[PDB]
Amino acid sequence: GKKSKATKKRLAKLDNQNSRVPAWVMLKTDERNHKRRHWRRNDTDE
Amino acid sequence: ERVVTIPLRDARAEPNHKRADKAMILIREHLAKHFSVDEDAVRLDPSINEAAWARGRANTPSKIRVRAARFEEEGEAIVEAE
Amino acid sequence: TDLSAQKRLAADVLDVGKNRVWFNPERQGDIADAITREDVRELVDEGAIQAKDKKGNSRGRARERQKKRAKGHQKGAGSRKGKAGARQNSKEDWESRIRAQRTKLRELRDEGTLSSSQYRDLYDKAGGGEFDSVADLERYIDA
Amino acid sequence: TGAGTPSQGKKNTTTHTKCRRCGEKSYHTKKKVCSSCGFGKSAKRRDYEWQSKAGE
Amino acid sequence: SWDVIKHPHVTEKAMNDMDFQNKLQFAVDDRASKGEVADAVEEQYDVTVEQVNTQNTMDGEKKAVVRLSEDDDAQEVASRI
RNA sequence: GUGGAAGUCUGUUAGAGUUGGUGUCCUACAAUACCCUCUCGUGAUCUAUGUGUAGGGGUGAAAGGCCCAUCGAGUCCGGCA
RNA sequence: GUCGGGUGAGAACCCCGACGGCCUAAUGGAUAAGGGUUCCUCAGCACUGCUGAUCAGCUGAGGGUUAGCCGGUCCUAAGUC
RNA sequence: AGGGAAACGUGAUUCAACCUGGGGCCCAUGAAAAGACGAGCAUAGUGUCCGUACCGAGAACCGACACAGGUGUCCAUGGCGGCGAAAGCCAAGGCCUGUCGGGAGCAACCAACGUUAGGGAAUUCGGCAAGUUAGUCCCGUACCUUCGGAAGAAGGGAUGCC
RNA sequence: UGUCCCAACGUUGGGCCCGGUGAACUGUACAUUCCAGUGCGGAGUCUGGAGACACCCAGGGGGAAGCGAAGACCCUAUGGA
Ligand SMILES: [Cl-]
Ligand SMILES: [Cl-]
Ligand SMILES: [Mg+2]
Ligand SMILES: [Mg+2]
Ligand SMILES: [Mg+2]
Ligand SMILES: [Mg+2]
Ligand SMILES: [Mg+2]
Ligand SMILES: [Mg+2]
Ligand SMILES: [Mg+2]
Ligand SMILES: [Mg+2]
Ligand SMILES: [Mg+2]
Ligand SMILES: [Mg+2]
Ligand SMILES: [Mg+2]
Ligand SMILES: [Mg+2]
Ligand SMILES: [Mg+2]
Ligand SMILES: [Mg+2]
Ligand SMILES: [Mg+2]
Ligand SMILES: [Mg+2]
Ligand SMILES: [Mg+2]
Ligand SMILES: [Mg+2]
Ligand SMILES: [Mg+2]
Ligand SMILES: [Mg+2]
Ligand code: NA
Ligand code: NA
Ligand code: NA
Ligand code: NA
Ligand code: NA
Ligand code: NA
Ligand code: NA
Ligand code: NA
Ligand code: NA
Ligand code: NA
Incomplete structure (x- = not known):
């Protein structure tokens, strides 16, 4: 497929939103990323 | 150490397209029995392998002369073609 | 590793x-x-x-056979698989023949052996398939 | 040909896309009209009294 | 007002371009053209920009590969920051 | 003899279809699959991509077929408890 | 697939050598759509993998896509606004 | 210039690509626009913006799955073979991942299948299934017919290697 | 011509044993049954007799009017299309 500059941007955001909750936040909150998205199991928008 | 003739007639009891594999196992089981050693301890030099797979996986020779030695601290046998 | x-x-x-x-x-x-x-x-x-x-595949055995077939062998009924016009395309073969016969007549003319009228006549009979081959043509030429 | 599984294979066309206006993935890129907010059809936002119960 | 240069893009591959080809890689604002990147770079590091290759990254930013004239030295310009 | 016509022939060329085996499967590999067999294969041919037609309305070489696993009237929500 | 060998706490299935095979319009090579980071590297095995796994499309962190002359862009088509 | 360890060839045939001609068909007539040419040469400057990773499939797409399904284009000139882009065998290239293994001469039963004497459709709704025939050449070919066809009718003969 | 007389033997993948992985259908309760009888006239459970030491493996499916589906046939509804 041929993506646009806008499209590329969002895919980028999504990849970022796909990281895990930093170890330091665990400690800081005395104790899960519910939006984890797998490329195969899930499906993004557009 | 001695030279022994291994009969591979029981390899026919196994589906023909898988004779080579069964042969191989037979050799090991023969040496382990005639040299009173665990089959784990039996080492087959590749020569024996190539001899057995010479004509494909289903066309194994009815016999095979093999030369084996026995020794070491846990007991074992090393073998090869002849 | x-x-x-x-x-x-x-x-x-x-x-x-x-x-x-x-x-x-x-x-x-x-x-x-x-x-x-x-x-x-x-x-x-x-x-x-x-x-x-x-x-690379060895074309040795293929070369031997290639000789036997160029010499005429191993091409009997029992060695043919394709129809006849398949082994030799009849239209292509008529183009080969007629161009021979037309070339031949062309030479004899320039050569002088033939008068533009004798040539004409022969030509017209070639195109009419009157000669199975140049040889057949030369023969006819000599009355 | 089965209308089921085998007919599902040819589905590689793109229709509904992220909407410039509402942000919902309902902008039909072929019709250039959004099935959710009505962008590309109505200046006003698509909205209906049947999206909720009669007395609510 | 948005600024063109964001910061230097320092990575193994950014090092090789620098040491081997006299190039400086930057993380720029994606609305910047090769032109704006060139000038902004010269004015900031006082150097002569020969070429600017750009790429819109899967990171949401735009990367710029700037080559300096044989007269300037990438390794040095980058060393002071 | 030349010529090379044809909703022409043979053809698992590619490709399109789906006659029989009422085989295999039938908590399937599969909510229509597998295999063998078989039809068409220069034409009313097959196909990709784009585009038009919308629900008592389309489309239909007509089987009430098809309109996203949904069709003697699609689907969603509402009328509605 | 087999015999050896490498690594490892742990090896039928991770890696090396040999032997033995499988694919020939594809099980090769280049791509459209579609997916969207799945690409590469390093570190890993609680999850995923029809058994196992030191392997991995998995988990974690890093890195990676450079164009005047390849596409888009421009033009017009059925047709659409 | 480049590339190759090295040689770093010459001739020929058949010739995909590409080029250029002739003929035939239509109760069917096979886009348009931008642009290019027409309309020279030197030197210099400019040539922004967007796409570019990977898969492209018996694990990266659709099908709830790492689904035996579905899904377009180019390579149609690798060798033997042959009519062939057919079968079979084999390169290049790719793979052992259509991804659980070990053991029993491994029984009954089942799936795919080979071979069965004598008989030969007696089986059965029915010859279902299976089988028979088979490529090429020569000889030869009925009824019927819209003269096109029937027709590869049938039937008979040949077929290797040197 | 193994369709048949009339079946045989063999090949490959299962089947059987072992390691690993590991579901579903189904379940008022009780339950080792058989022959009769009885009962809403089609009983493992009532009644009379008979038989029956408990557990487990394989099998081909006689019975549980076996499992699967609020019967498509028929009638009824001041039902629908
Ligand atoms: Cl492109
Ligand atoms: Cl011509
Ligand atoms: Mg990342
Ligand atoms: Mg002709
Ligand atoms: Mg349907
Ligand atoms: Mg670019
Ligand atoms: Mg035809
Ligand atoms: Mg045909
Ligand atoms: Mg279409
Ligand atoms: Mg009807
Ligand atoms: Mg739907
Ligand atoms: Mg990887
Ligand atoms: Mg690793
Ligand atoms: Mg690429
Ligand atoms: Mg798989
Ligand atoms: Mg017989
Ligand atoms: Mg009878
Ligand atoms: Mg039949
Ligand atoms: Mg009693
Ligand atoms: Mg009822
Ligand atoms: Mg009725
Ligand atoms: Mg009514
Ligand atoms: Na996806
Ligand atoms: Na940054
Ligand atoms: Na004629
Ligand atoms: Na079929
Ligand atoms: Na309607
Ligand atoms: Na309602
Ligand atoms: Na495996
Ligand atoms: Na050939
Ligand atoms: Na048989
Ligand atoms: Na039973």
Whole structure:
């Protein structure tokens, strides 16, 4: 497929939103990323 | 150490397209029995392998002369073609 | 040790199929340490990594048969599979023949043996398929 | 040909896309009209009294 | 007002361009053209920009590969920051 | 003899279809699959991509077929408890 | 697939060599759509993998896509606004 | 210049690509626009913006799955073979991942299948299934017919290697 | 011509044993049944007799009017299309 500059941007955001909750936040909150998205199991928008 | 003739007639009891594999196992089981050693301890030099797979996986020779030695601290046998 | 990364590299540096690249069984450790294309070329120069040879089919037996068939043999009813016009395309063959016969007549004319009228006549009968071959033509020519 | 599984394979066309206006993935790129907010059809936002119960 | 240059893009591959080809890689604002990147770079590091190659990254930013004239030295310009 | 016509023939060329085996499967590999067999294969041919037609309305070489696993009237929500 | 060998706490299935096979319009090579980081590297095995796994499309962190002359862009088509 | 360890050839045939001609068909007539040419040469400057990773499939797409399904284009000139882009065998290239293994001469039963004497459709709704025939050449070919066809009718003969 | 007389032997993948992985259908309760009888006239459970030491493996499916589906046939509804 041929993506646009806008499209590329969002895919980028999504990849970022796909990281895990930093170890330091665990400690800081005395104790899960519910939006984890797998490329195969899930499906993004557009 | 001695030279022994291994009969591979029981390899026919196994589906023909898988004779080579069964042969191989037979050799090991023969040496382990005639040299009173665990089959784990039996080492087959590749020569024996190539001899057995010479004509494909289903066309194994009815016999095979093999030369084996026995020794070491846990007991074992090393073998090869002849 | 996992040298699959290297294989891929070696395959490209030697410009060969990954399946032909060869790693010496006594240097998995060294090769395991190759990380760059360079370290690979180096290990190549030491002959630790080499490219096996690609085979080619032997056309020996095919050449012998090719002789026997050029000499006329091994082409009996029992060796033909295709229809007749399949083995020899009849339109193509008529083009071969007629061009011969037309070339022939053309020469004899310029040569002088034939008068533009005798030629004309013959030509017209060639196009009419009157001569099975140039030889057949020459014969007819001599009355 | 089965209308089921085998007919599902040819589905590689793109229709509904992220909407410039509402942000919902309902902008039909072929019709250039959003099935959710009505962008590309109505200046006003698509909205209906049947999206909720009669007395609510 | 948005600024063109965001910060230097320092990575192994950014090092090789620098040491081997006299190039400086930057993380720029994606609305910047090769032109704006060139000038902004010269004015900030007082150098002569010969070429600017750009790429819109899967990171949401735009990367710029700037080559300096044989007269300037990438390794040095980058060393002071 | 030449010529090379044809909703022409043979053809698992590619490709399109789906006659029989009422085989295999039938908590399947599969909510329509597998295999063998078989039809068409220069034409009313097959196909990709784009585009038009919308629900008592389309489309239909007509089987009430088809309109996203949904069709003697699609689907969603509402009327509605 | 087999015999050896490498690594590892742990190896039928991760890696090397040999032997033995499988694919020939594809199981090769290049791509459209579609997916969207799945690409590469390093570190890993609680999850995923029809068994196992030191392997991985998995987990974690890093890195990676450079164009005046390849596409888009421009033009017009059925047709759409 | 480049590339190759090295040699770093010459002739020929058949010739995909590409080029250029002739003929035939239509109760069917096989886009348009931008642009290019027409309309020279030197030197210099400019040539922004967006796409570019990877898969492209018996694990990266659709099908709830790492689904035996579905899904377009280019390579149609690798060798033997042959009419062939057919079968079979084999290169190049790719793979052992259509991904659980070990053991029993491994029984009954089942799936795919080979071979069965004598008989030969007696089986069965029915010859279902299976089988028979088979490529090429020569000889030869009925009724009927819209003269096109029937027709590869049938039937008979040949077939290797040197 | 193994369709049949009339079946045989063999090949490959299962089947059987072992390691690993590991579901579903179904379940008022009780339950080792058989022959009769009885009962809403089609009983493992009532009544009379008979038989029956408990557990487990394989099998081909006689019975549980076996499992699967609020019967498509028929009638009824001041039902629908
Ligand atoms: Cl492109
Ligand atoms: Cl001509
Ligand atoms: Mg990342
Ligand atoms: Mg002709
Ligand atoms: Mg339907
Ligand atoms: Mg660019
Ligand atoms: Mg035809
Ligand atoms: Mg045909
Ligand atoms: Mg279409
Ligand atoms: Mg009807
Ligand atoms: Mg739907
Ligand atoms: Mg990877
Ligand atoms: Mg690793
Ligand atoms: Mg690429
Ligand atoms: Mg798989
Ligand atoms: Mg018989
Ligand atoms: Mg009868
Ligand atoms: Mg039949
Ligand atoms: Mg009693
Ligand atoms: Mg009822
Ligand atoms: Mg009725
Ligand atoms: Mg009514
Ligand atoms: Na997806
Ligand atoms: Na940044
Ligand atoms: Na004629
Ligand atoms: Na079929
Ligand atoms: Na309607
Ligand atoms: Na309602
Ligand atoms: Na495996
Ligand atoms: Na050929
Ligand atoms: Na039989
Ligand atoms: Na039963």
